[PDB]
Design a protein around this nucleic acid. Structure first.
Ligand SMILES: [Mg+2]
Ligand SMILES: [Zn+2]
Ligand SMILES: [Zn+2]
Ligand SMILES: [Zn+2]
Length: 1190
DNA sequence: CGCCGGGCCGAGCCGTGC
DNA sequence: ACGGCTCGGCCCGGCG
């Protein structure tokens, strides 16, 4: 099957996993933990995950056989049929069968990763249609966690419910009119009062969906809002049901296309209404003039991304505005999943608001992306303070030049993958001319004329190179270098002109200016001025003349300097003269034929059209497609802490104080009463919250207590009683309210682990599980000593933004070649042996690259683990690391904030950014998209030792973010569907570029460009992926966003406004103000409204009063009453709002709203805070009184 | 020997027509 | 849309 390398890779991964698991088992066998074994099983494929998560036992082989024979959907259907009939045992009532079938089928369709089956589906019940016919139907109860499962999981849940109800011989739901009205008002209310819904269904759509769904979509209450249509039959609540209405809105409705596709593939009938809903929902001119008109007609600008701007977050471009982001088709080494490629120069020159990993809301392909440094694409063109125009394609040049920048003429490039267009089904935009298109035209012309075969981006035969060099009269070494790396090696301008003359191809894109950004009449005036009042120095090369310098006076140039700047032409101004130097003089004069032919403006023509019609050297439109973007959600590489930081899962109650400090309570002699689980030693009879008896070191047993009665029964005796009190008729509980003395426990712990000098030790106010089993205090002491925190399930986690990578260089990650050869890497991505640090190596599917903050924190985590192994269990240490570079070769676990299964990865290097680099398969296996998402990482051994299922909260949602199972191998066939559209080609073919001009759809050329989906099944899924664009460094550029270094809101707004003013294609002056004023006005008006209807609270307690007490003091205290909405929380943004109103031109509506808001704020407090203080001077240049007096 | 004042910590809160 | 913004109390250093 697999070759002799990937199998060995997986074998070594399994070997390391076994090495860790043996130590974890040996440590756990001693009985100092809630269980006597590890509580994280390891799986290998989807069937094992499904069996471990939902069951039933023995289903793995059946799932494997059915998916092998028919396919995923048909296998799920056969599994449903087999469960219903009774292959997998006897469950009981039909409700059990229905619930099990729904859960298992949803797990199979969902690949058993996200916890929608586990926690989304609260319960399954059979109800009766009493009001209509007294029939029997099925209802699905949706909890809170289903609200974060995605659109696809909910629609498939409805489909599975329908299939199971049809297979169980049950009738359909027949709602009354009151049900419909209740659902419409609920949909209307939730959007108004809770959340934007990310989608707004029309009322008629809601009526149609309610009338044509054979099951009842219901649930419990999740919002504290009352409804109007009350006491509806069959509905047991009078409040908003967020789970069901979100399922209806974002499930069968928003994802109707995928649902009908699944219906077609699945052989399911009875859903014709959804299909119908989907079907209903679904002269003499120039070449470029027509192209522009057609492009504007078919593809229209999208404004949905820039509808809102938050203060401090800049807007970088207007929709489809020239001068914004230049669209380039390709995929870099560390981009392609959903991320963009950006030059570091345009990161530096926008005031460092953009850092590696900073998210931005995009317009054309999708909505949202993450930026990654690419050093082969072009950077911004800027205008300096003295008048010079410069091209900043470098990072150091930008750092040197930043302080002199007056205006940013052009913003730069953005590399967007073809798979991003395929996934979102976005019509192809016309392609800007670039070096990769030029090299293909070059080789094609060479073959057509001289019959010589050459290919770019590879190595060619010496005979062909010699023949081509002889025919072109060039140096063979130069030809080899330029064919090997067209994106970095460019010919001189004279050589490019010679190539265009001989072969007959357009000019090299590097020497083409933005000729279509100006009008033909402006070029006419500029041509006249150049002919009349200019002096030019000419040259010669192979019989070809080219300009070497242009000198024209400023007074003679006039207002054509703006035309020069709009072409992106670099020049300089000295003592009244504007000078154009050597490389950029022929870039301006050669297209105009060296002034040999007159330039004249013509209607229905463009500048490039006239140039091509008259000149002999041909040109292509260098910039025609532009993109809009807006900043949002800066990158993150921080560790995870609870809302109050916690270091041990031990309840303290109120003895610890406001910070729940256990040590402070222990040192003050306080006694505390809390609910915990007490364990009792069978031999001597010790009692307390400890798993081991200190006197004899023999494992105790949990005590079960009656709720009303107060009899304690050990576990062995309670087993016989069926966990019910014999003298009573009430079920037992493992916990009760008891009193504890922290002094003895903390002294015993300190003596146990020999850790005495710890100042603070924070716990919890109370436990959330149903067991209320506490944690040993020794672990808390060791965590406090090493400065690490804990999570809800007993693990230490680190959150970071995720970015993709497929190929790497040993110098970027700081690892020697010998170390890599020890890890297993022996070749580079071209088959050559690995002997250098500048060679490009291909990443294995489960190898990850950490940041340096992550390494710094994992050093402390490893030290804590070693201390735990040496002091608590008495076993040899494992990591033995003194620096972060010593963690290389060790394993981690990657977990997503919405799933319940993890995946094993390996550490191979570190970077100096704030992102998490890994393979696209690694991010897809966690159901992540990599366009702003964040995930957690933890060391494998720490999770193995520390995780427990008895610390998980008992409510719905306590099983999300839990490593209930971990995958030990990667299979691209069952990771995701968005990663199946990614490109694996070295370069795009000429046909793609020729078809972009026809505005085709990406589906028409799926077979032309190879994707991931074209390799599934064959052994070469992990073997030969490739990339299009190259980058010098993977972590070059700014590392932290400026937004995190600004304190005041006024400072944030001012900096964002200077940024918007610098960029030519933003138009801040009014647009950014009006859009920004819809972020401060909501705050002002909402705070003003909530002030007059607010609740008061005691400082000593947390009890809240809906009405202020008449005495002014807490009735059950002496403490004083404080507000929940202060007066200063209303007028905190009024100064910035007034500044925004006065310094810019907004519509009169917003100005009057601001003035009236200030007047209302003044008038509301008339009798409470009268104006009793005068002032020396009046009229502080305020605008409200000026408007009133006008 | 008795204050003044900082610097942490922990609470709460963020458009809406009858 | 949610981290950013107001309050209140509680020790800990100087400092005279
Ligand atoms: Mg996403
Ligand atoms: Zn004992
Ligand atoms: Zn009892
Ligand atoms: Zn009180």
């Amino acid at each position: 099957e697999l070759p002799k390398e990937m199998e060995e890779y997986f074998e070594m991964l399994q070997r390391e996993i076994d090495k860790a698991y043996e130590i974890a088992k040996k440590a756990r066998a001693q009985g100092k933990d809630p269980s006597l074994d590890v509580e994280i099983p390891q799986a290998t494929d989807m069937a094992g995950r499904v069996e471990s998560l939902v069951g039933p036992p023995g289903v793995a082989k059946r799932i494997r056989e059915l998916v092998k024979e028919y396919g995923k959907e048909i296998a799920a259907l056969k599994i449903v049929d087999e469960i219903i009939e009774g292959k997998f045992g006897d469950l009981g009532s039909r409700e059990k069968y229905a619930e099990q079938a729904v859960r298992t089928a949803l797990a199979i369709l969902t690949e058993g990763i996200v916890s929608a089956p586990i926690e989304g589906i609260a319960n399954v019940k059979i109800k009766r249609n009493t009001w209509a016919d007294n029939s029997e139907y099925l209802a699905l109860y949706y909890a809170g966690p289903i609200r974060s499962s995605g659109g696809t999981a909910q629609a498939l849940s409805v489909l599975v419910g329908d299939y199971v109800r049809r297979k169980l011989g049950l009738d359909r739901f027949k709602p009354s009119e009151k049900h419909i009205e209740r659902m419409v008002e609920e949909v209307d209310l939730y959007h108004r009062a809770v959340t934007r819904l990310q989608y707004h269904p029309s009322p008629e759509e809601v009526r149609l969906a309610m009338r044509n769904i054979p099951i009842e979509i219901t649930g419990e209450a999740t919002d504290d809002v009352e409804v109007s249509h009350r006491d509806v039959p069959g509905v047991e609540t009078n409040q908003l049901r967020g789970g069901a209405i979100l399922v209806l809105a974002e499930g069968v409705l928003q994802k109707a296309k995928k649902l009908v596709k699944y219906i077609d593939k699945m052989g399911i009938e009875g859903w014709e209404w959804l299909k119908e809903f989907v079907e209903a929902k679904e002269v003499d001119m120039g070449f470029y003039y027509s192209l522009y008109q057609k492009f504007k007609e078919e593809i229209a600008p999208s404004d949905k991304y820039a509808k809102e701007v938050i203060g401090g977050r800049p807007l970088f471009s207007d929709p489809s505005k020239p001068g914004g982001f230049r669209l380039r088709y390709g995929r870099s080494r560390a981009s392609g999943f959903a991320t963009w490629g950006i030059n570091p120069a345009t990161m530096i020159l926008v005031d460092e608001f953009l850092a590696i990993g900073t998210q931005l809301k995009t317009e054309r392909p999708g909505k949202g992306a993450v930026v990654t440094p690419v050093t082969t694409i072009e950077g911004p063109i800027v205008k300096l303070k003295d008048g010079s125009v410069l091209r900043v394609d470098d990072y150091n040049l930008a750092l040197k030049v930043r302080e002199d920048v007056e205006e940013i003429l052009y913003l730069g490039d953005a590399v967007i993958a073809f798979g991003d267009f395929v996934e979102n089904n976005q019509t192809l935009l016309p392609a800007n001319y670039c070096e990769e298109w030029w090299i293909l035209e070059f080789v094609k012309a060479l073959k057509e004329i001289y019959e010589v075969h050459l290919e770019p981006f590879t190595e060619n035969e010496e005979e062909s190179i010699e023949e081509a060099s002889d025919y072109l009269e060039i140096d063979p070494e130069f030809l080899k270098e330029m064919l090997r790396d067209p994106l970095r090696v460019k010919p001189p301008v004279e050589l490019a002109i010679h190539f265009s003359e001989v072969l007959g191809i357009p000019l090299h894109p590097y020497y083409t200016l933005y000729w279509n950004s100006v009008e033909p009449k402006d070029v006419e005036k500029l041509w006249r001025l150049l002919k009349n009042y200019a002096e030019i120095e000419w040259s010669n090369f192979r019989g070809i003349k080219f300009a070497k310098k242009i000198v024209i006076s400023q007074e003679k140039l006039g207002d054509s300097k703006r035309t020069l700047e709009l072409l992106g032409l670099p020049h300089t101004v000295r003592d009244g003269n504007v000078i154009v130097d050597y490389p950029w003089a022929a870039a301006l004069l050669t297209p105009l034929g060296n002034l040999n032919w007159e330039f004249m403006a013509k209607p229905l023509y463009a500048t490039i059209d006239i140039i091509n019609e008259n000149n002999e050297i041909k040109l292509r439109d260098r910039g025609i497609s532009w993109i809009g973007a807006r900043m949002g959600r800066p990158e993150k590489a921080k560790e995870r802490k609870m809302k109050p930081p916690v270091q041990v899962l031990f309840p303290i109650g109120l003895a610890g104080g406001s910070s729940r400090d256990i040590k402070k309570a222990a040192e003050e002699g306080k006694v505390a009463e809390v609910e915990i689980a007490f364990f009792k030693c069978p031999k001597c009879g010790h009692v307390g919250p400890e798993h081991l008896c200190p006197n004899c070191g023999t494992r105790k047993e949990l005590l079960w207590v009656c709720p009303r009665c107060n009899a304690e029964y050990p576990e062995s005796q309670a087993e016989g009683y069926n966990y019910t009190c014999p003298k009573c008729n009430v079920k037992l509980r493992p916990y009760a309210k008891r009193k504890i003395r922290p002094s003895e426990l903390l002294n015993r712990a300190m003596e146990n682990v020999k850790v005495y000098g710890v100042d603070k030790l924070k716990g919890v106010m109370g436990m959330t599980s149903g067991w209320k089993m506490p944690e040993p205090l020794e672990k808390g002491l060791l965590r406090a000593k090493n400065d690490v925190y804990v999570f809800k399930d007993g693990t230490i986690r680190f959150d970071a933004t995720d970015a993709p990578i497929t190929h790497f260089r040993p110098r970027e990650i700081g690892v020697s070649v010998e170390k890599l050869r020890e890890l297993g890497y022996t070749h580079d991505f071209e088959g050559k042996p690995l002997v250098s640090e500048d060679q490009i190596v291909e990443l294995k599917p489960q190898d990850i690259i950490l940041s340096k903050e992550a390494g710094r924190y994992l050093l402390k985590v490893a030290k804590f683990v070693d201390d735990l192994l040496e002091k608590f269990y008495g076993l040899p240490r494992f990591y033995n690391a003194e620096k972060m570079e010593d963690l290389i070769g060790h394993l981690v676990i990657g977990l997503a904030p919405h799933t319940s299964a993890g995946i094993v990865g390996r550490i191979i290097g570190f970077v100096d950014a704030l992102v998490g680099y890994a393979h696209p398969y690694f991010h897809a296996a966690k159901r992540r998209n990599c366009d702003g998402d964040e995930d957690a990482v933890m060391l494998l051994l720490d999770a193995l030792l520390n995780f427990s299922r008895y610390y998980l909260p008992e409510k719905r949602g306590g099983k999300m973010d839990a490593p209930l199972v971990i995958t030990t191998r990667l299979d691209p066939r069952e990771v995701d569907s968005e990663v199946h559209n990614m490109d694996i080609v070295r370069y795009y073919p000429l046909e793609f570029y020729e078809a972009t001009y026809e505005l085709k759809s990406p589906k028409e050329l799926v077979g032309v460009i190879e994707r991931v989906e074209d390799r599934l099944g064959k052994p070469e899924m992990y073997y030969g992926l490739k990339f299009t664009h190259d980058t010098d460094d993977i972590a070059l550029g700014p590392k932290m966003s400026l937004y995190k270094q600004l304190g005041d809101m006024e400072e944030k707004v001012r900096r964002q406004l200077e940024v918007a003013k610098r960029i030519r294609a933003v138009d801040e002056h009014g647009v950014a103000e009006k859009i920004l004023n819809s972020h401060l006005i909501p705050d002002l008006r909402g705070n003003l409204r909530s002030f007059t209807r607010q609740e008061f609270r005691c400082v000593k307690c947390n009890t809240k009063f809906r009405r202020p007490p008449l005495n002014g003091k807490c009735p059950v205290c002496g403490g004083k009453i404080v507000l929940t909405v202060s007066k200063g929380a209303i007028e905190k943004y009024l100064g910035t709002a007034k500044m925004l109103v006065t310094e810019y031109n907004v519509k009169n509506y917003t100005r009057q709203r601001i003035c009236l808001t200030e007047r209302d704020i003044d008038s509301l407090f008339e009798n409470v805070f009268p104006e009793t203080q005068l002032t020396l001077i009046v009229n502080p240049n305020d605008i409200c009184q000026r408007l009133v007096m006008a």
